[PDB]
Amino acid sequence: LTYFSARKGKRKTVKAVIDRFLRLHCGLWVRRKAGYKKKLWKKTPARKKRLREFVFCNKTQSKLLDKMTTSFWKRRNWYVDDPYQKYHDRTNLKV
Amino acid sequence: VENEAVAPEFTNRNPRNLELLSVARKERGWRTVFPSREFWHRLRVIRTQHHVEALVEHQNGKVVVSASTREWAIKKHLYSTRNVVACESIGRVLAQRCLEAGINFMVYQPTPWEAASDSMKRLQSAMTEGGVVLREPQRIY
Amino acid sequence: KNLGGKSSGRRQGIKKMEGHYVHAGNIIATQRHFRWHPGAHVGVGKNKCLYALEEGIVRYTKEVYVPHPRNTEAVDLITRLPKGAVLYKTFVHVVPAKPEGTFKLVAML
Amino acid sequence: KNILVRMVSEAGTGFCFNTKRNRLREKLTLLHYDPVVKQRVLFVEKKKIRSL
Amino acid sequence: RRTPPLGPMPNSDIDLSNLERLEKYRSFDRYRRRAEQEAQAPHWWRTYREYFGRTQQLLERKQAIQELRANVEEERAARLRTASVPLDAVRAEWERTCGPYHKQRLAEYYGLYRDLFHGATFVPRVPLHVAYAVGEDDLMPVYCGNEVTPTEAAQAPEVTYEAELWTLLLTSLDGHLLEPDAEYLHWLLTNIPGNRVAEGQVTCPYLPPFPARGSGIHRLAFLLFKQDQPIDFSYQLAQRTFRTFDFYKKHQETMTPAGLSFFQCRWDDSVTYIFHQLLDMREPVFEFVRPPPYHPKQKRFPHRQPLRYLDRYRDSHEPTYGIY
Amino acid sequence: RLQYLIDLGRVDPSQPIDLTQLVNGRGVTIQPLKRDYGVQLVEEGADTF
Amino acid sequence: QKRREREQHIAECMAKMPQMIVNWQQQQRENWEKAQADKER
Amino acid sequence: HLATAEWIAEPVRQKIAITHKNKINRLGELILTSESSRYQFRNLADCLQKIRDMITEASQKLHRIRIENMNRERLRQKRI
RNA sequence: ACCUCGGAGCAGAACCCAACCUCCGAGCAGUACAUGCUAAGACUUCACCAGUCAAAGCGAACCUCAAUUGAUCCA
Ligand SMILES: [Mg+2]
Ligand SMILES: [Mg+2]
Ligand SMILES: [Mg+2]
């Protein structure tokens, strides 16, 4: 990525990352599964049910996506009727 | 009140308790092997050379209710202990014996030739007309 | 002139050895042909994989194999046997740990 | 040899689903299940999507 | 590294050199028979069972059936399969001959012996008959293991049995509210002359059965005792509680059990009447509570799980707002 | 939160509570860039209000 | 109005459905009879 | 207390006194709860809605029990 | 000559194990149209991506085969 831009001297986000992923405020990245809309005629319904899911990301995938976006994308967002809003705070972890 | 000192956890040690709430486990497994062990009560017909025999069992193999023709009460009113009349007779007798045992649901699983025998169709018609449903309610999870 | 044969290991075999506590739905063992058969409280997938249907402890036994009468392969294998000959297989059982619920006092009406 | 066709529901409409059928046999009509009507309904095939 | 088998291996003795000289299972059914026999035998490997477990009679019977098959309508009816059986004769003669062993099976299956006598099995020789009055027309009979409502069992039953002293006992093997071991009796009539019941010393008088709501299905024991020498004995549920084992231990010298009939009860509205009216307490209501579902330990990064994973581990389904 | 602000003198309930009074009591920080369109009341703490 | 036209159209087609199913299964039996009659030759 | 409730009609008090008899106390009190929310407004509203549902429905697993009752009546076929 | 996928030996008994090592194969076909929708718990080709299995539930009846395949963007 660009660590220091030529105009501002700031970091830049990679906009592929924003275009594909969802950062929850607790640090979890949500994604969509690869091939969830390809060749559905030859996939069993169990597999199609698996592909139509919002799948969390790895730890190192998560840290790779944190480094590729900026602090704007890491921020609390109090939207109006947000579908994912109950998934931001992390309930009831025992580490 | 001394009278209403109730333990917070009721203990019912009726063996047939959980099976009559249709809550108790059936042995779900055994899919490569005949017959299925998934029942609470099984009706097992034993047709020997000479005698027709009818059992009602648990999964334990504890025979709950039997009716054989090797029994003077039923044998003497019969012509031959092995024919279709023997099976209709042992179906009436078995069904009447099972209503008074508080058993209302068996499973009968025959081989596909014993299914299409006349004497077991007559046995099943005797059981169903007697008052016993030959199909268990599902387990409530 | 020997092309192909570069397939990797399937990583099959037993996942829960005997004595292991097992929760409901755990895969006990994945096989490619029936090395182990489902016994008490053990289910089978389309891939011949043995999973668990109750929570309990896995046990392996040796039992009499009596196939379903509509299974003409194994049934035709039966009728060729001599008169004492009885087939055995190894089965997998889950001995269920918990009771399936208790009665508890709710209210003194 | 086979064709992937779409099947359009006759009622509770706008519902399609794809099937395979031979190049040579007739135009399929089926009884599939509409989750919009939530019933089994005749579907009629309307367009071949791809000759697999 | 082979270790040799402990006992004999199966399929050893039949394993010969000439299989084609050995006659085979032509069928499926014979293999199922032999196979079940080998299932029931004790083995040395680990099996499923380890973990989840006079002359005048034959004379009159031979002449009786020989006279029975000789009639032409019996043969003609039986070959046209329109012959039937009188169920009543079979019922009463079953009450006479081999009924006691079958009532022994039903008492062993319903756990009356492991609970009522700590495993001391016996045989109910006396064909006892108990029935509850259902109005004035008909009456609900008590056979071994029946279902009878506590409305039908509101009033003390009619007891008839063909015999010649006696002590009759009713208990509720499971209906005890406090102790998981004892049982509330319902009526204990003693020193009974012959086969009339009313002239018995009513020591503990009749309660109806009271199973609590949602506490499952209860079994209720009618013991009937051969008494030799007439002995003297002895709505508070601290007073209806005893155990039939160590009760019978005090009196087993000149008294032996001779009759059973037991039945099931569930809740009914009459049991509301029993708890409120004549016991004078609030009724306890039970519910069958299943154990909470296993979920594994929650991870920081639940890799590849769906988004539903975060809901397995929450406890409120309402928007929490935190410090704001 | 708002009961908390009223108890500690930071928001005077004997006057109208506009958004300026929640800002000047520093009860709520709202930033119009980052496109906050204001405050939403939240049912948390409805009992004991 | 969009919702009413869709809902009305679905309700009409569903009113016409069971007759179309019975006609369809009769056509299936014609494929049974004609198929098996073509099997004989 | 269901018996003294002037604000429910007498036939509706009988229908409630019969259908919801498993909620009625020893003291004749219809008792009904809600633990569906963290907010006691929403649980109180759930309780009151249960009551209004009982009056509107009162103004205007079973299968096993059907069979066990039919067989209990087949053994009831025993007169004097 | 090959390049991807699967079976067997090497690699004898949990898993894994190479080679321009030894032998077979695959790039489909057939049936069904609830091959619907949901969902505990798991396995996993040594990562990831992909893959697999699945009870309970709602709704209904009363898939075989080993491989049988192709990401993203764009149309
Ligand atoms: Mg290989
Ligand atoms: Mg390799
Ligand atoms: Mg791995």
mmCIF file of C-alpha atoms in Angstrom, chain E residues 319-324, chain F residues 1 40-44:
data_model
loop_
_atom_site.group_PDB
_atom_site.id
_atom_site.type_symbol
_atom_site.label_atom_id
_atom_site.label_comp_id
_atom_site.label_asym_id
_atom_site.label_seq_id
_atom_site.Cartn_x
_atom_site.Cartn_y
_atom_site.Cartn_z
ATOM 1 C CA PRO E 319 -29.928 -3.638 21.610
ATOM 2 C CA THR E 320 -27.375 -2.883 24.261
ATOM 3 C CA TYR E 321 -25.868 0.575 24.161
ATOM 4 C CA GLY E 322 -22.889 0.465 26.510
ATOM 5 C CA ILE E 323 -21.486 3.628 28.045
ATOM 6 C CA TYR E 324 -23.748 5.831 25.938
ATOM 7 C CA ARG F 1 -27.258 8.636 30.815
ATOM 8 C CA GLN F 40 -31.464 9.281 19.272
ATOM 9 C CA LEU F 41 -33.083 8.473 22.598
ATOM 10 C CA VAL F 42 -32.460 4.972 23.746
ATOM 11 C CA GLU F 43 -34.663 2.854 25.958
ATOM 12 C CA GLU F 44 -31.802 1.685 28.196
#
